[PDB]
Amino acid sequence: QIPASEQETLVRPKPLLLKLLKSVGAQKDTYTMKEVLFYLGQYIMTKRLYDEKQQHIVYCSNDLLGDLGVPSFSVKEHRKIYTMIYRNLVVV
Ligand SMILES: C/C=C/[C@H](C(=O)O)N1C(=O)[C@H](Cc2ccc(F)cc2)O[C@@H](c2ccc(Cl)cc2)[C@H]1c1ccc(Cl)cc1
């Protein structure tokens, strides 16, 4: 549900986000929104930060996502995830 033009947007992650990404392998300083979310999901899957049916993202105060009235995300609310992300980076 997010335009391709917008999935292409090249961005630069702030320290907190960049650190999460690198923890999962990322090597660059800049990425496309698509790449950022891709690495975000990889973290989520590797840390199993999700509900039983993998329908909702569930994280803790102890993980890197928590660090990133706590926000709860559903895996299908694309827009909302993008918005939060937009706070953790600066466009290029
Ligand atoms: C808003 C962008 C979403 C976007 C996509 O849906 O295409 N998306 C992804 O591209 C990656 C891809 C992926 C999948 C498996 C894996 F091992 C490594 C990478 O993660 C996705 C995902 C989906 C469900 C769960 Cl429980 C966890 C991660 C999912 C996603 C990534 C981050 C967040 Cl907050 C929510 C959903």
Curated annotation (Swiss-Prot):
Induction notes from the record:
By DNA damage.
The ranges of region (Necessary for interaction with USP2) come to 1-92
- For the region Sufficient to promote the mitochondrial pathway of apoptosis, what residue ranges are annotated? 1-83
Quote the record's domain comment: Region I is sufficient for binding p53 and inhibiting its G1 arrest and apoptosis functions. It also binds p73 and E2F1. Region II contains most of a central acidic region required for interaction with ribosomal protein L5 and a putative C4-type zinc finger. The RING finger domain which coordinates two molecules of zinc interacts specifically with RNA whether or not zinc is present and mediates the heterooligomerization with MDM4. It is also essential for its ubiquitin ligase E3 activity toward p53 and itself.
Purpose: E3 ubiquitin-protein ligase that mediates ubiquitination of p53/TP53, leading to its degradation by the proteasome. Inhibits p53/TP53- and p73/TP73-mediated cell cycle arrest and apoptosis by binding its transcriptional activation domain. Also acts as a ubiquitin ligase E3 toward itself and ARRB1. Permits the nuclear export of p53/TP53. Promotes proteasome-dependent ubiquitin-independent degradation of retinoblastoma RB1 protein. Inhibits DAXX-mediated apoptosis by inducing its ubiquitination and degradation. Component of the TRIM28/KAP1-MDM2-p53/TP53 complex involved in stabilizing p53/TP53.
General remark: MDM2 RING finger mutations that failed to ubiquitinate p53 in vitro did not target p53 for degradation when expressed in cells.
What name goes with this protein? E3 ubiquitin-protein ligase Mdm2
Q: Which organism is it from?
A: Homo sapiens
Full-protein residues shown? 18 to 110 of 491
